[PDB]
Amino acid sequence: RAYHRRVVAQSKLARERQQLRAAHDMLQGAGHESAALETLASERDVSLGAVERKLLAMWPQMQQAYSGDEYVVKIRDKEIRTGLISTTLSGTKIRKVVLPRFEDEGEILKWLMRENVPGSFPYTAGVFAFKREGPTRMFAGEGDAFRTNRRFKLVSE
Amino acid sequence: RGPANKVRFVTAASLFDGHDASINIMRRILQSQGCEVIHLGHNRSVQEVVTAALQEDVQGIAISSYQGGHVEYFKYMIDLLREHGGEHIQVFGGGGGVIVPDEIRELQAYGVARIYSPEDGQRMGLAGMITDMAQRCDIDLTRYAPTTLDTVVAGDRRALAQLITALENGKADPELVSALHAQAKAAAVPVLGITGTGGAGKSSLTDELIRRFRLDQDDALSIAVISIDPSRRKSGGALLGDRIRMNAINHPNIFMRSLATREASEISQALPDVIAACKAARFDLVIVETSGIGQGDAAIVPHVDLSLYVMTPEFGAASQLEKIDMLDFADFVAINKFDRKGAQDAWRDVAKQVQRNREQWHSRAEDMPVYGTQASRFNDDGVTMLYQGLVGALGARGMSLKPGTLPNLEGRISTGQNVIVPPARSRYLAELADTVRAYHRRVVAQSKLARERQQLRAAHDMLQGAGHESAALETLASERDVSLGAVERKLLAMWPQMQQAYSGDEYVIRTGLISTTLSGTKIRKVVLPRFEDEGEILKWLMRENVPGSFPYTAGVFAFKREGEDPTRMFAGEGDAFRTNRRFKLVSEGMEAKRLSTAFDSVTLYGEDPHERPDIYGKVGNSGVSIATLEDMKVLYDGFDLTNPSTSVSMTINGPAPTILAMFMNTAIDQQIDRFRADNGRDPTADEEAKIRAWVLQNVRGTVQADILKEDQGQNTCIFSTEFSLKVMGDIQEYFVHHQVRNFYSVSISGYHIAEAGANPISQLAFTLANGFTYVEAYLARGMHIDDFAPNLSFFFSNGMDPEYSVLGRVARRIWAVTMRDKYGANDRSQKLKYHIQTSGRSLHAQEIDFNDIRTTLQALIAIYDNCNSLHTNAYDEAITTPTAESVRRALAIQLIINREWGVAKCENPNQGSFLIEELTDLVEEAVLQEFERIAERGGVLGAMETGYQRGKIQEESLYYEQLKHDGTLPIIGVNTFRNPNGDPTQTLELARSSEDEKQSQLHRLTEFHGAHQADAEAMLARLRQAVIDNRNVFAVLMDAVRVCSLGQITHALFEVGGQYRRNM
Amino acid sequence: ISGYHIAEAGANPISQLAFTLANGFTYVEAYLARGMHIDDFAPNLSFFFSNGMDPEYSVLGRVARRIWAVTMRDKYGANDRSQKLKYHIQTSGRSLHAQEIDFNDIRTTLQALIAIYDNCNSLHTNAYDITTPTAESVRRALAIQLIINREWGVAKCENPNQGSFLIEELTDLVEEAVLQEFERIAERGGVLGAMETGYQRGKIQEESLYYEQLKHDGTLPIIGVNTFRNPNG
Ligand code: B12
Ligand SMILES: CCCC(=O)SCCNC(=O)CCNC(=O)[C@H](O)C(C)(C)COP(=O)(O)OP(=O)(O)OC[C@H]1O[C@@H](n2cnc3c(N)ncnc32)[C@H](O)[C@@H]1OP(=O)(O)O
């Protein structure tokens, strides 16, 4: 419950912060240069937590990742490319992981904290990035140890 | 290299069978392997196929029979072939799961070469089957050719057909050849050559001219037709597609042979030999059709006595006519497709050009042998005019003919002033595409405004909370209040009030919102978004409002019906008595009676049941056999059709107006009987009039009748396309006049288009396009958009493809937006209601238990996406009509989802989903682009003219099927995860028709006929006069079905409405 | 840590999920009080749930993952491997009946679907049959997963649940419902203190009876059992 209270508060902050800087850019586009807005904006940069600030910051980079046809990620000294697209008979590109198209940074942060993509805290949509491709266990147990073993050896041949 | 010999095939679908998806992908592999294929198309009797194969002198026959009655059908064919010198011709068949293994062994033992099961297709592969089929027919037929002309000259048409196969292959003796030409010279028979540009209508015009010859001369003339189509030298074989357009050649005095060019030329290298062969066979007239010739091509001229150049009004500039060699030699010129734009100006250019080429300056340009014809139009006066001219010319050229019985009219130009869609509105589909895209552009702009407006006032409130009051922000805010539209401003304003409505436990006229689980969780019927951004709110409210609000993306109604579930099970087997049992079986335990009627192949083609094995074997199979009004009454006995909780969905296309008239008469007669019982007396003339009128208004149900999809998808069109559309409008006009506000005049469908092989995008696009065509058709016909649009029903298919998940919601939005913005119709018209039926092709004969899994998933996304009506397929889908046990499993799928399934307690679970919204957008745009592709082909009608839809469907069908056998596209139990046993479905129970039931229908028919034997001829005459005098056809049908059978009515209309011309 | 038997005994999805997470947390507290480190046993902890027809089952796994991840990070300060809750889902066997056994494949399909949608780690599918597990019956059960994973179109997407207004609201509701149940067990002396009173056993038995009641009541429709019954058998 405490975590969710934080999501609400941090969202309101991230939302207000965007609303301010948005109005600031619109005023300068009309001529009026009121930095009084910026003072309230910078005030909410500190109000936002460290983790929350980095979440929103990585969001545009996050979008470009799940956008393409592949997912390039380098572990150790090599790399691990993963396909994102599965194409239908009609020729439609079905993305493995579909990202939200919110403009409100309040909704973005709210979503990133409550239900991040698969493979990211709090792992709501899954604990792994992408599902494993290709896992059926072989259950056997009857009679004495000899019969159960044979069934094991037979199935797992 | 292809085959060793010149291998020829005759391919067709069985009698009253529309299933061409199978047979079409076979004639494609046949052609590619190097076989000349004479394709006959769908709906072919044994008499038709056998006559064809015998005249063409082919090695093999390929038939697809999915309607059943195949055992009787193929036996008839085998018998008929042996009886008329065709024992050596091998017959091949296929019907998927319909033809059970026992019947295959029986038919193959009877004489059929091979019949392929779906399991055969898997093992052998698509190419493997055709290879096996071709290798069998790789034989030399020249050994059967006559050595002397004795047989041929005597009148033997079979010997003639074989002599041609000898002459064509050059295996004919030189002394025989010269002896043939010698007698051909002394024969002195006229030879009419018909050449022209590709697809101008050479075949269609030829058929019509022959029909004129038959009507005018009482079938006294013996006509020989030699049609030539171009051959692809790559494969080796060709697609001889001229015979498929010929409907008037089915007669003993008519003979037709299809020849491939067998060169890069527009005439067969042995054409003079073939012509001479027909001349010696004592024919009264020989007609020769060439292939698509260019501007500077005219090789038909030296081989014929008279030449006819066929063209379309589309020839570009008027200077182009000076480049056409054929305009310099042609004795007659026929400007076909005179319904097209600029036909009159086309005639005045061509006429003046022919006048110049002949240097007849002392004559009038209007006197030149240039004719304006419309072969597509039944009994076209233009074509008749051309005929009269050809007669006069053939008469002077030594051809005895009796004084004609046809209207010896005067003029050179057709007066066919009928139009379905005016050329001014030709690009209607493209406009609709623009309308939708324009709407979305507005959503983007209005969102940005609403977003900015909020951001400003938000910052304004935060500044005043800190002290610094800057009214400069407010100036920009008030600036965007005006920028926002009136409708958009009210949308956001009602949003907080909207939230409070769907928040509580009731919707205040009060409706419950909450369904509580066993765990005690409150599952709201409609879940609203929790956005803070007013930009997202407005964006959502404009793109996907709640169910029951524009653009009705999540449904056209606020909440799903309380008692009447969307369930509506397709049914039909045996006679009207047995089906009436199945209706009561499905609708048992349901207060709301939702019936869905399936008719047998014979009724679907407007024919009466008959003793001939062609027809008899199909009676009561694949659907209920309905032939008379009395059958229709029995069908719905015990069902109050005028009851508000009872709706009937008849699936009928070609004879739909006739069947509808039977249904209406039944619904009326029910209330007349109900009155006679509640008062113990017959209603007075005034009382009955009030009753009859009331029935028409409140009767609830749906008739399919979508003819646009018939040409494109289902092939149940019996009359000419233009005639069917004419009568369809008559129905809608009848409905408007009598205020039939509950019955749906047409179920604009795409299920059939999809089952033929079209992917979800093509299905949805074509179907909406067809629907919009009807709209444009009725609008150009003088009906208010709000008068017919609420009566428009839709029908779709749900398969496994991802797009099917959002098919319905896309259809609803595209309709709602266009109906509002483009056509300016009211709310009732913006609401697209549709029926979804699970994909039948997605179910297989192998491991039939797996089909219930697929049918479940498909049923799910239909209910999720808030469909209006749902049909569920049985597990034995591939093999038989749903059994008693089988229909309950199919019926349970809906019952379990609706009642047991937890997520289903929510009515908009799709909404919000990132995948669903993105897919909805993608599919929508994909459809719009397809609209534009059809629009640049002359609209839906203009595209059908080219066979664009049919071409695109059959291509996609092949692409899918190539992958099914391939393995690239996994199908569990078919191409992967096979059974270690290898048994596709022991002995399963089948839904065939009783012998007694067939005899019952025959006896009931002959009894009905005897009852109204007096008024029969008189009524049918009135019906034809209704077409001639161009009155309302359906209005007469409302009386006609009382004294006439289905067959009588259909065949009567054939004399005055024409028959459908197949389109490959 | 299992919760299959708890649900199979009659517990509704809320009770099942709550008790199971509570049991898991008990093991955590148990191992911690032996002076052990949280990153040493938490990655080895596996879970085992049931998927029935109830609406809550659609979001059961995602709720379990979030409650675990948040608590393991904030409360116990464990690492990433420990915050990740892996679980096996097995379709409800109770939900399948002896009457009209062909209908069971329909229910088992729907239950298998929401498991895969909600990105489960391991899935078992129940046969249509009552009788012995025949090799034919197990193939129909095994085909359900094969068809969804390979043939089903929506399944090509790995997060189709995300975004859905219903799913997100249900996720929140179930989560809080579980938390309240934690508090009910906590005020009974923890899981062990509750077992001392037979609180879980009592509550499960109470819910099993309530289900079995509405079933007989005709209030909770079961196709082929209390409605749409076989006209021949
Ligand atoms: C697609 C389809 C339709 C489409 C037709 C589209 C079209 N243009 O062809 C639509 C939706 C229009 C339709 C309508 C109807 N259909 Co239908 N349809 C089907 C369906 C789903 C598949 C048939 C198909 O095309 N399969 C694709 C082919 C390529 O594959 P296959 O059949 O497995 O064939 C293989 C081998 O056998 C071999 N083979 C097959 N034929 C041939 C031919 C040759 C020459 C060769 C060499 C090989 C070969 O090639 C394939 C290799 O894999 C079947 C059910 C099913 N899935 O079996 C019902 C089915 C055939 N139809 C049926 C019925 C009843 C109808 C209707 C009459 C219903 C009605 N009462 O209104 C209507 C009207 C038809 C008409 N127009 O006259 C019933 C038949 C019942 C019976 N005969 O006992 C079926 C079995 C469905 C059912 N269980 O109710 N249909
Ligand atoms: C041969 C190859 C295989 C095939 O082709 S099989 C072909 C199978 N085809 C079919 O079964 C087609 C079935 N479809 C139809 O009959 C129609 O398209 C249709 C519209 C779905 C019929 O559904 P119905 O149940 O009759 O619905 P309806 O719109 O006519 O409703 C009648 C009036 O009742 C009210 N109503 C219905 N649903 C409501 C709701 N949810 N909330 C509030 N009011 C509602 C409403 O007043 C409506 O009338 P209106 O809207 O005032 O005009």
Ligand SMILES: Nc1nc2c(ncn2[C@@H]2O[C@H](COP(=O)(O)OP(=O)(O)O)[C@@H](O)[C@H]2O)c(=O)[nH]1
């Ligand atoms: N709009 C229109 N189409 C026609 C007319 N006559 C024939 N067609 C169509 O043109 C197409 C090709 O006809 P076809 O006889 O095969 O031409 P051919 O291959 O050159 O001999 C078919 O779709 C016909 O229905 C006509 O008078 N008007």
Ligand SMILES: C[C@H]1O[C@@H](n2cnc3c(N)ncnc32)[C@H](O)[C@@H]1O
């Ligand atoms: C075209 C589709 O229509 C359905 N269909 C065709 N005929 C019947 C019938 N008599 N009963 C039920 N469903 C039928 C099948 O599901 C088929 O695949």
Ligand SMILES: [Mg+2]
């Ligand atoms: Mg032609």
Ligand SMILES: [Mg+2]
């Ligand atoms: Mg031609």
